[PDB]
Nucleic acid binder design. Structure first.
Ligand SMILES: [Ca+2]
Ligand SMILES: [Mg+2]
Ligand SMILES: [Mg+2]
Length: 429
DNA sequence: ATTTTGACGCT
DNA sequence: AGCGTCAAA
């Protein structure tokens, strides 16, 4: 009752760019705008692998991971943009730079946590308090929320936009605007701010995005996906029981893999809401102390993970796969590709040092051997003392050379299906 | 023969 | 330290 926390103490948003790499390419090439199109890496093998897909193309069934040749069977007029290739490998610089554009705009509004190349969490609690003081009891107009959905509404006693407006009207007609401590009002002001933030992103970059607004990161992330693209969704604390009552467990962030499968298998449930019937101790007994407490609160819509103040990635990495017959089988091959990776890494590190006043101090080398299901077969670290590609490639070879079983120095066995260099452990400079 | 990333947890 | 999990385009 009066002491039961309800996880309504924060306003958190998650902003996620729509079909991000596709929008980057469509901004650059107006011929691709408003078309079924996809972004592909490599072209020789089955037309290249698709990594991003416009919503027009998704209507034909085109998805990520599809070979372009196969996507063309579903969508013969599909347009394609290719990821840049440099030093023999795909190079994602254009998308990293577009990401910086968006992150820098979002940072003007509030502290953000960079969650991926195209998404960030936003802690809006303080901004909401400020805006509520500015508003001075003034009601919030639907015109301030032109792309907002209120999850769960409309309810009670045939076009999409019509439903959106009906739900928003019910919500705003039911708000108590004089209570500055009302969580629902705080979320609503949050959504007003997010409309402003999304408008700024689109104005200043050309890119559209979706967003979720709720009381914590997990619900904000879930909310964001409910009405893509180019829309935002408010998930209130009160919407949680109905929302979770038919929500597959795997849809909640962190439960899409083995742990989620085990929750389903061990407990014999399917939906997030069903978790409420277990005690905290029961959940801890199956999934561990940390996961158990997290599940117990999360299934009630409560999560405390903070929006971390971090706009920049903590690692800078470069990797290449060598699938099937292309696996690296000679020492020379391994050294040449380590050099290519190290040269890209050097370029990115030097730019990072100039832009962000920091230097990486550890180099992580990872390889995969043909026949291993795991992404990485072996990982070794060494000191990163100079931004020099020849030194980094030599040091990586030094730390992995003993993995070569082959009695012949010139041959590498078992062949390598992957090389990965990652700069970590940044210090101020 | 998706590939190329990035964060964080465990021991 | 080195390995595993989960998530992005
Ligand atoms: Ca996205
Ligand atoms: Mg994303
Ligand atoms: Mg996606």
């Amino acid at each position: 009752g009066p002491h039961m926390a309800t996880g309504q103490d924060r306003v958190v948003a998650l902003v996620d760019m729509d079909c991000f790499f596709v929008q980057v390419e469509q901004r650059q090439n107006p011929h691709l705008r408003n078309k079924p199109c996809a972004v592909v890496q490599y072209k020789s093998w089955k037309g290249g692998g698709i990594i991003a897909v416009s919503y027009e193309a998704r209507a034909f069934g085109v998805t990520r991971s599809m070979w372009a040749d196969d996507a063309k069977k579903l969508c013969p007029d599909l347009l394609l943009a290719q990821v840049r290739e440099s030093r023999g490998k795909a190079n994602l610089t254009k998308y990293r730079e577009a990401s910086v554009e968006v992150m820098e705009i979002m940072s003007r509004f509030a502290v953000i946590e960079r969650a991926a190349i195209d998404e960030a969490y936003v802690d809006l609690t303080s901004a909401v308090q400020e805006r509520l003081q500015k508003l001075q009891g003034q009601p919030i107009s639907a015109d301030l929320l032109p792309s907002t959905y209120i999850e769960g509404l409309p309810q009670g006693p045939v076009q999409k936009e019509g439903m959106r407006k009906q739900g928003l009207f019910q919500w705003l007609d039911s708000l108590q605007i004089d209570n500055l401590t009302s969580p629902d009002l705080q979320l609503t002001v949050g959504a007003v701010i997010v409309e402003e933030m999304r408008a700024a992103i689109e104005r200043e970059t050309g890119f559209q995005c979706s967003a979720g607004i709720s009381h914590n990161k997990v619900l904000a992330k879930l909310a964001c996906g409910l009405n893509k693209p180019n829309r935002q969704t408010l998930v209130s604390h009160g919407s949680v029981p109905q929302l979770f009552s038919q929500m597959p467990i795997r849809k909640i962030r962190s439960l899409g893999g083995k742990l989620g499968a085990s929750v389903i298998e061990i407990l014999g449930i399917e939906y997030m809401g069903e978790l409420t019937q277990f005690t905290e101790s029961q959940l801890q007994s199956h999934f561990g102390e940390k996961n158990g407490s997290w599940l117990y609160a999360m299934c009630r819509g409560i999560e405390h993970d903070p929006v971390k103040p971090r706009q920049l990635p903590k690692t800078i990495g470069c990797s290449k796969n060598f699938p099937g017959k292309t696996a690296l089988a000679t020492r020379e091959q391994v050294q040449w590709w380590l050099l290519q990776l190290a040269q890209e890494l050097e370029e990115r590190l030097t730019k990072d040092r100039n832009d962000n006043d920091r230097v990486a101090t550890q180099l992580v080398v990872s390889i995969r051997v043909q026949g291993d299901k795991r992404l990485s077969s072996l990982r070794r670290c060494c000191a990163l003392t100079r931004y020099d590609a020849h030194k980094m490639s030599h040091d990586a070879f030094t730390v992995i050379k003993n993995c070569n079983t082959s009695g012949i120095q010139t041959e590498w066995s078992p062949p390598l299906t992957m090389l990965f260099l990652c700069a970590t452990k940044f210090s101020a400079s």
